[PDB]
Amino acid sequence: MYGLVNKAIQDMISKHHGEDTWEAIKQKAGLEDIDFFVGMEAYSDDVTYHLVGAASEVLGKPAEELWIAFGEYWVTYTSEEGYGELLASAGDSLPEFMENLDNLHARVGLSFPQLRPPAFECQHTSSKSMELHYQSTRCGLAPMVLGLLHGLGKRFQTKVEVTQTAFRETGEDHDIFSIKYE
Numbered sequence: 001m002y003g004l005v006n007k008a009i010q011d012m013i014s015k016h017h018g019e020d021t022w023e024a025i026k027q028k029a030g031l032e033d034i035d036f037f038v039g040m041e042a043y044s045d046d047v048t049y050h051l052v053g054a055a056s057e058v059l060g061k062p063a064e065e066l067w068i069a070f071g072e073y074w075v076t077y078t079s080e081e082g083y084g085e086l087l088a089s090a091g092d093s094l095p096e097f098m099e100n101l102d103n104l105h106a107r108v109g110l111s112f113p114q115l116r117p118p119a120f121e122c123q124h125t126s127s128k129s130m131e132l133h134y135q136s137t138r139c140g141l142a143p144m145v146l147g148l149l150h151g152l153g154k155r156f157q158t159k160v161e162v163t164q165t166a167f168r169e170t171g172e173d174h175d176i177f178s179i180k181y182e
């Protein structure tokens with residue numbers, strides 16, 4: 001993934017646990033060589049997955065909790081590190097934002113030519129609920145999506161109830177979530 005993602009993970013961990021713990025994780029992940037992540041540079045997805053695993057070990061938390069934390073963190077990080085206006089342009093409510101998300105990533109992709117973005121499709125089941133279809137070229141990022149949805153819930157001061165109803169990994173087509181919001 002692009003360096004920006006790895007910087008965001010480093011930032012979250014540093015801000016929450018200290019540069020010492022971060023350095024420990026970085027070392028364990030096998031990334032001691034890398035002096036710093038270059039935000040607009042493409043990296044192997046391996047870097048990101050290794051960071052998360054190593055962090056799960058050092059911190060003694062399941063990796064899923066780390067993807068969730070990171071998903072939540074991302075909503076704030078992007079808004080503060082150069083993508084606040086983009087985020088705003090995607091709307092002022094959860095359902096509208098989720099409808100705009102493919103278009104938001106298309107806009108990101110204008111600048112990150114090698115982007116492999118997620119795809120999100122909403123099937124609205126009422127004015128306060130939807131079924132969200134998440135399609136990805138990558139494995140294991142459902143928990144990150146859960147965190148991101150909570151982050152957007154905070155962004156929009158909206159209560160978000162999310163349950164995963166289908167799983168990419170256990171041989172279903174793609175991840176699906178049922179969501180209620182108020």
Ligand code: HEM
Nearest residue numbers: 001002075078083108115116117118136137138141145148
């Ligand atoms: C705030 C709501 C957002 C959500 C819910 C979201 C969702 C996601 C998810 C789930 C992924 C994982 C990649 C995959 O599934 O294959 C991803 C990747 C990514 N997103 Fe978004 N995103 C959001 C906002 C943004 C914004 C504002 C930016 C601006 C830079 C951004 C840039 C990226 C980048 C660079 C990747 C890495 C993909 C790659 O490097 O190929 N995202 N996003």
